[PDB]
């Protein structure tokens, strides 16, 4: 059994981290106090759920998690929340003043002041691991901490844990939900600095989550709690294979092996189905599988029909058997525009976990008998890089807001280095995709 350490950075990472660990606890039968009646090995064990939870002699199951924010108000909610007993004080790390939506303030000015403290607290979690496989890092592209401190931590993790895998869940900026005016700048600065250091990154476009919340849950004005509970369901789909018995994606290295043949192009597109309003009809394997190809169920809005596939995994949860998957795949392939790159086999890796998805009691989502998350590495996701790159271009041509970054010690040249990297990234997609 190899352990996974979760790192939640900034507001988006910490609140999404909060949603996930609530879900993990419900899925594993761990109570808010950390007690797990089903775990007959007290004070230890090497079960699959021990990838994410350690154990105390008192039977407490403790997340292998670090929450770090440059400001206290968000992590303070964890310290006094319903799951307060679950976390160690040393796992929650807060600065005093945040990065003011400024990548440079987060990476340079304030990151230099707190990076060693964060790395130390992570060491205390690594030192309890008999075989630590790597990190899951949760953060926004757009925040000052989420972009700037994350990329500093990413650089430092590659140094201090070189042989270890690093996966990202990144909140991609959408004006529908919030957005500082400078979020394109931060998005690109952090991608350029983190590209070398991340093995696989799952982008979640806040516009996709917002729309799914309005359209499929009939929430008029979705909140962060609406957004995060939906996001954490998808995150649970993705991380379930590390936390449960199975054969597909059982260690972080397999995510790269299954989804990322070409190292820079390491952003799989995630599609999730079904999402059903709790206040509001049981979909079939063929129906939920076909929904994986409707653009309205993607975590990033784009058209996969206009790109090429490099890898494709279907992660089922609930009442699903292989016979029904293969039939649905035969049907879909003769009706949908699914074209793979000429240098990769046209195939699906399928995983089934029999436990139906769990929902948060009193949440907006309804219990369903089966659900599926598709992870596909399509060049079509480059649409999202182009949109972002274009907004960067508009502001950078007048150097609007640049002075706040230079004011923190950054050089104007980091901007254009960053942009040129994304120009190269966009081209890598253009070659593989047509």
């Amino acid at each position: 059994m190899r352990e996974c350490i979760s790192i939640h950075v900034g507001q988006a990472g910490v609140q999404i981290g909060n949603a996930c660990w609530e879900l993990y606890c419900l899925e594993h039968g761990i109570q808010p106090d950390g007690q797990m009646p089903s775990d007959k090995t007290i004070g230890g064990g090497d079960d699959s759920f021990n990838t994410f939870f350690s154990e105390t002699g008192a039977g407490k199951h403790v997340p292998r998690a670090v929450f770090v924010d440059l400001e206290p108000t968000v992590i303070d909610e964890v310290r006094t929340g319903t799951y307060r007993q679950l976390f160690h004080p040393e796992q929650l790390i807060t600065g005093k003043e945040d990065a003011a939506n400024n990548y440079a303030r987060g990476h340079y000015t304030i990151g230099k002041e707190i990076i060693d403290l964060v790395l130390d607290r992570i060491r205390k979690l690594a030192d309890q691991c008999t075989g630590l496989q790597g990190f899951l890092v949760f953060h926004s592209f757009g925040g000052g901490t989420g972009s700037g401190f994350t990329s500093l931590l990413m650089e430092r993790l590659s140094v201090d844990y070189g042989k270890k895998s690093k996966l990202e869940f990144s909140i991609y900026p959408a004006p529908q939900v919030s957005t500082a005016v400078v979020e394109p700048y931060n998005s690109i600065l952090t991608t350029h600095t983190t590209l070398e250091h991340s093995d696989c990154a799952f982008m979640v476009d806040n516009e996709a989550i917002y729309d799914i919340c309005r359209r499929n849950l009939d929430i008029e004005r979705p909140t962060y709690t609406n957004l995060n509970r939906l996001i954490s369901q998808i995150v649970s789909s993705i991380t379930a294979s590390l936390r449960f018995d199975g054969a597909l994606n059982v260690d972080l290295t397999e995510f790269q092996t299954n989804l990322v043949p070409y190292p820079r192009i390491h952003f799989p597109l995630a599609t999730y189905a079904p999402v059903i309003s709790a206040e509001k009809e049981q979909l079939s394997v063929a129906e939920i599988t076909n929904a994986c190809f409707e653009p309205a169920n993607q975590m990033v809005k784009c058209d996969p029909r206009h790109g090429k596939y490099m890898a494709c995994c279907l992660l089922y949860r609930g009442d699903v058997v292989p016979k029904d998957v293969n039939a649905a795949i035969a049907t879909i392939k003769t009706k949908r525009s699914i074209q793979f790159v000429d240098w990769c086999p046209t195939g699906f890796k399928v995983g089934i976990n029999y436990q139906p998805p769990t929902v948060v009691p009193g949440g907006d989502l309804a219990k369903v008998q089966r659900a599926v998350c598709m992870l596909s590495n399509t060049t079509a996701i480059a649409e999202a890089w182009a949109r972002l790159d274009h907004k960067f271009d508009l502001m950078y041509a007048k150097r609007a807001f640049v002075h706040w970054y230079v004011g923190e010690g950054m050089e104007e040249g980091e901007f254009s280095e960053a942009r040129e990297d994304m120009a190269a990234l966009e081209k890598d997609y253009e070659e593989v995709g047509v």
């Binding site: 529908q176 729309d211 653009p295 309205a296 809005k301 525009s337 649409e383 182009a386 949109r387 274009h390």
Partner: protein, 313 residues
């Protein structure tokens, strides 16, 4: 008040469509690069589909179907017809894309020495390859009288955001003025290539009322029965074939598009598909009526304030 931007200045059709939309006092034209638009009259080339449909609280519509080029590029049409199961195709001339199988079938025509002319117009191969798609030349066209003239038919077809397929009831015959010699002014019917020009009809353009009167008088048949059942068939086959690849049914932005299909009628009153034009112009006499219908069924159906045959609902 709806808002639109204009990104194709050379479009005569959408110059008129914008001139009409403003003329209702309910539409407002913005600068080229304002993203806050309801409708994009976009550019022929490198239209940024990836940036459409991401503006909060804006239904966005564009006048081009992303992926429709697979029909409107000559190499692509041949590939699409050949490899689509739903097209396999008795109305598309034999075609080969070359940058060998050609030669093969060419010899099978040397065998019985039957009509072995091809276009890219030559009679022997090695003169063509020394000079793309090689396409069987239709040696027995239907010739108009008086004049022993060639022609082609241009049909205007509008696909709306619901993927309803509307055929404009006015077509155009683009006729040759020098008689047909079994030199190319009598072989290529292009409206530019002719300007003998202007003899029989104003501008080498015969409209449907007169072609139908002609066919009634000369051949004892109608435009509908002899030709138009076949045209409606080809349009529907072509566009239903690509409907899955290009449709915007559950997409974050919607599409419509005007197409010009080009047909040829041989002397057995069979219709063949020449090519599909993705950014066509209109006949001057029809600009008014057709552009208003674009506004009526493609733009107002999405943004509320028939000269069309429904091929699809």
């Amino acid at each position: 008040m709806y808002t639109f931007v204009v990104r194709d200045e050379n479009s005569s059709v959408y110059a008129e469509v914008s001139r009409l939309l403003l003329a209702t006092g309910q539409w407002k034209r913005l600068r080229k690069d304002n993203p806050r638009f309801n409708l994009m009259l976009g550019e022929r080339n490198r239209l940024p589909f990836g940036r459409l449909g991401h503006e909060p609280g804006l239904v966005q519509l564009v006048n081009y179907y992303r992926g429709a080029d697979k029909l409107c590029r000559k190499a692509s049409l041949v590939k699409l017809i050949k490899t689509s199961p739903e097209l396999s195709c008795t109305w598309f001339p034999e075609s080969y894309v070359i940058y060998e199988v050609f030669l093969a079938a060419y010899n099978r025509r040397r065998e019985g020495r039957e009509g072995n002319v091809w276009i890219a117009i030559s009679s022997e191969a090695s003169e063509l390859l020394d000079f793309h798609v090689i396409q069987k030349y239709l040696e027995k066209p239907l010739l108009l009288e008086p004049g022993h003239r060639k022609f082609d038919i241009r049909s205007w077809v509008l696909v709306d955001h619901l993927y309803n397929i509307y055929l404009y009831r006015e077509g155009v015959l683009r006729t040759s003025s020098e008689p047909y010699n079994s030199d190319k002014t009598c072989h290529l019917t292009n409206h530019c290539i002719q300007k003998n020009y202007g003899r029989y009809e104003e501008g080498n353009e015969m409209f449907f009322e007169e072609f139908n009167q002609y066919l009634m008088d000369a051949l004892n048949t109608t435009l509908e029965n002899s030709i138009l059942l076949q045209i409606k068939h080809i349009i529907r086959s072509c566009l239903m074939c690509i409907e899955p690849a290009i449709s915007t049914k559950h997409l974050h932005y919607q599409s419509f598009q005007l197409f010009g299909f080009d047909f040829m009628v041989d002397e057995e009153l069979k219709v063949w598909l020449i090519e599909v034009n993705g950014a066509p112009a209109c006949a001057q006499k029809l600009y008014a009526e057709l552009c208003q219908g674009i506004v009526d069924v493609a733009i107002s159906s999405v943004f509320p304030l028939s000269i069309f045959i429904k091929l699809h609902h």
